[PDB]
Amino acid sequence: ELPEDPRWELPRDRLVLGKPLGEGAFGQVVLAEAIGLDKDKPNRVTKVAVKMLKSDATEKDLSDLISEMEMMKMIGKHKNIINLLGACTQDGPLYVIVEYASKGNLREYLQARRPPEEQLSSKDLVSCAYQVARGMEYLASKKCIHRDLAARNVLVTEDNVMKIADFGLARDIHHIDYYKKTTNGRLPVKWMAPEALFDRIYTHQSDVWSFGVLLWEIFTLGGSPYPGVPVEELFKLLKEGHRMDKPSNCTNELYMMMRDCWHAVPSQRPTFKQLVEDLDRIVALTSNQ
Numbered sequence: 001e002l003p004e005d006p007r008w009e010l011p012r013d014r015l016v017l018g019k020p021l022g023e024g025a026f027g028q029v030v031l032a033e034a035i036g037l038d039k040d041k042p043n044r045v046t047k048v049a050v051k052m053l054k055s056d057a058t059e060k061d062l063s064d065l066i067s068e069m070e071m072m073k074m075i076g077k078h079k080n081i082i083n084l085l086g087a088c089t090q091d092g093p094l095y096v097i098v099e100y101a102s103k104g105n106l107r108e109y110l111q112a113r114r115p116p117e118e119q120l121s122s123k124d125l126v127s128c129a130y131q132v133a134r135g136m137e138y139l140a141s142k143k144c145i146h147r148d149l150a151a152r153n154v155l156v157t158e159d160n161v162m163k164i165a166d167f168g169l170a171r172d173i174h175h176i177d178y179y180k181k182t183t184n185g186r187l188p189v190k191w192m193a194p195e196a197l198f199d200r201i202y203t204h205q206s207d208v209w210s211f212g213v214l215l216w217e218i219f220t221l222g223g224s225p226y227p228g229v230p231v232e233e234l235f236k237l238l239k240e241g242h243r244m245d246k247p248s249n250c251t252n253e254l255y256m257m258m259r260d261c262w263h264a265v266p267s268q269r270p271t272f273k274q275l276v277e278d279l280d281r282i283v284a285l286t287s288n289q
């Protein structure tokens, strides 16, 4: 059995399980309604996402889900990350309950708003980047390295708030399969800094490289990096120092940002604290017209 933790325990009967949002292989995420999540409002329901372990799941799968939950407890709350809201741990299968993001991942959100029901100004796109940088600056401030920052791991709420997700996932790095694709058919190696990819060294500076690729995804409205490039050719591109071309409808100043994220020398990349401040000024100067 699992240890009881009254900071986070929600009685099982206060959770009304709904439809599946999809499955990992370790688990399954469902939409749910939580009744009386706040102590002050016991008669209010809150929509929430609920993680739980699929059927034929092992001890390793369990401990991995537990590690993720414990990490989110230590990291604390921020507007631009997916926050932990409670857990059902006792007398039945483990549920971890987190903030629900109604508008899906940022990649989907962006592709759905491409020119042909809703469109995005240049201010909105820069604001999107500012929010992800903020979440990242917070995460970094609590000593967390994401290791897979990408538009697909950013979620968007009903109020269009960007939230970093999957920042507490268990990795067991160097067991990563470079050939295996996302369900969308893309390859996660295309977001990884060369030091993380060749030498398996992960740092905040490598997450900054990943954030550059994310900026490029945002300004191409959800484009796919290096389309048609398989793993071995990607390796050759990185060795040669190739850098992705500037998206149309991206200012020079934002492209220079991406390129600074993609500095071959990790120490010379900007920090998330620096990116936050620059994006803050750029948002303010960018037209919504």
Ligand SMILES: *S(=O)(=O)c1cccc(C(=O)OC[C@H]2O[C@@H](n3cnc4c(N)ncnc43)[C@H](O)[C@@H]2O)c1
Pocket (backbone or CB within 6 Å): 021, 022, 023, 024, 025, 026, 027, 028, 029, 049, 082, 098, 099, 100, 101, 102, 104, 105, 155, 166
């Ligand atoms: S598990 O195996 O560790 C794990 C980890 C991440 C995601 C999943 C999963 O099954 O995702 C399915 C589907 O649901 C979306 N999702 C995940 N969390 C949320 C929240 N908080 N709000 C809205 N949607 C969410 C994922 O993007 C994915 O599309 C399993």
